[model samples]
Target chain A: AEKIKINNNVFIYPMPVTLLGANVKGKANLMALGWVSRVNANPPMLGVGVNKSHYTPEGIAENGSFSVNFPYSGMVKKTDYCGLVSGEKVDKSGLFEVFYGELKTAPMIKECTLNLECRVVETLEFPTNYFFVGEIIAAYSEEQYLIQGKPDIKKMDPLLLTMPDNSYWTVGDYAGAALKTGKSLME
Target chain B: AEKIKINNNVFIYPMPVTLLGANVKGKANLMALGWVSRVNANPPMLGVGVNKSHYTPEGIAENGSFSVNFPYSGMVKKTDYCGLVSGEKVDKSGLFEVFYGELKTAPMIKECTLNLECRVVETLEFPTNYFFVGEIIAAYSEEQYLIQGKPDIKKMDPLLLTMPDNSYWTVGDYAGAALKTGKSLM
Candidate 1:
């Protein structure tokens, strides 16, 4: 079938729905975040896009630190709840079991399978978003979630989000090995 | 259990594996790209990180146009093949059926489930990666992939990548509604 032109504006691809934790004042706060990516390779960097009006960026800008928490599929209730409520509207300090890493300003979630404490490296302003790029200073996780000293997908079982549909999903069955699956076609 | 510090340098999360298509010296080349994301709101912008050693960035810097193609779970072999080989080492023009949008410089994959043509808006130089933030000028999908005028995930069945493990996966059964599911707490 022939391809047809669709919407030019779309952010509906599958994204990791992480809890963006930061300290608004002296207390901890977290909100749902999806527009995040690894923008750099060496010295590990994270790029997160937050709307200008969101209250989460205040703490990130204040201390130059923030946290990205990967909630398991079971935490869907609290995960989606973070998106529904904003720090401006309510007090989210007591929402989850918050912890501190080397970066005191950033707060990590205890219930989450994976957490990363970051120090902001650069900030870019868009029309409606404040894009903050951070270097991953330290990453935290329980030993149970690690496989061969790495975070395992089958073990972590993190939640994935989709927009327009406004739905959440779990990681399906493994398809094949990447970087190795296509080596046969090399000749 | 107490949280212990793992590797400070880790990117082993679930990510969308897409074929980044660019015309290098007037020829089509695609590489498997995972470091891509939406960086802006209105007049959508896509930020993609390509290593400085890659030949794909040459086309993007020259013509200021590029394409991002999402392959289905079925296209895993060809998708990863693009990553295994380099355009400098081989010609990839005839790897898949190629198409062009309004921007003639960027080439789209016909067999892919979804495609987007973008015009370079800004470029940022990092230590190892060239981050290009492009404004998505056009998006293409066929009727079979659309559900209520939007691309359906179940229908498209796009591939997802996990690194360190280096594995590919399909989307699982629907978990729940996103914005609507948490309304009960409020």
Candidate 2:
């Protein structure tokens, strides 16, 4: 097979989709986000990159806090809707049953399977977006979503987004154990 | 049902797994990484978080260049092996057929379905890991892995990692169309 040099503007194969929650003028606003990843190990921290033009940044800047909600496959319609419209023009607070964590400023969604309440620790300014680093102060999940006291991927049924094609996908079969699967190579 | 407050140290439900490649002491080293995401739109930038203790970080700092290669399900064993062993102790260059892009220092894997050669633009220090933001200078893919000039997920058959559980998964069935699926509500 021949290798081809494609465009440099490529995205990760499939990005986990989540709703970024923030309060603007005390109103809850949600934006669909995929540019997020865990950036720290101890004192668990994650970073989310949001375009400067989005209304969600205003809310993130206002409270120095934000919420990350992972919507299941069933909530795909609502999740996609949040990304299409802006909170600056539309009121999204009514879309979901909103809740708050220890941090009263960060608004979370009760409908989602998993929720993380984060307080801003640092914010990096990029050319077009702001990479907000937040420490996960608290994580929320329901009893049914847990398997042996941890969030179960099968039960959660989270949604994944792939760009250039703009498609949503679900989690497939468990391929194998991580750390354990590669040990065969050593032997 | 009430929402139960779990541990604060929660990870993203499932993360896309990739092999982060770099030259350490002029030798090719590969590490399995899930702490990665596309951070910028224009100029093509992506950020990868590497633990400070890892041998790969030293190589990244030395060259200011690296490569991200997405491995398919078939290479799961080798991918896992890279994470388990450290480049400092093990010579991982022999594990795969390595190639260099325009940057020359960044080593890429020929076995993987997708590859991105990156030049480090900025490095942010965190408590345990350094988030290296790199400008993707070029992306490489094969003819079969692409559909309509775009990387096809089904063909690529990339692996995803879920933490705490320490498991890897394959991409499932297409759920729906993006940006268009929720338009009915409007």
Question: How do the candidates score on chain B by TM-score?
Answer: 0.97, 0.99
Instruction: Quantify all predictions' global Cα lDDT against the true fold.
Output: 0.88, 0.94
What share of the reference contacts survives in each candidate?
0.74, 0.88
Error of 2 at A24 (Å): 1.0
Encode model 1's per-residue lDDT on A93-186: one tens digit a residue.
Answer: 8979899989888999999999989999989878888889899999999999999888998889888888877889989999899999899899
| Over 4 Å off, model 1 | none
Q: Which stretches of candidate 2 lie over 4 Å from their true place?
A: none
Task: Give the C-alpha lDDT of model 2.
Answer: 0.94
For residue A174, give model 2's deviation from the true position in Å.
Answer: 0.8
Roughly what TM-score does model 1 have, to 2 decimal places?
A: 0.98
lDDT for position B35 in model 2: 95
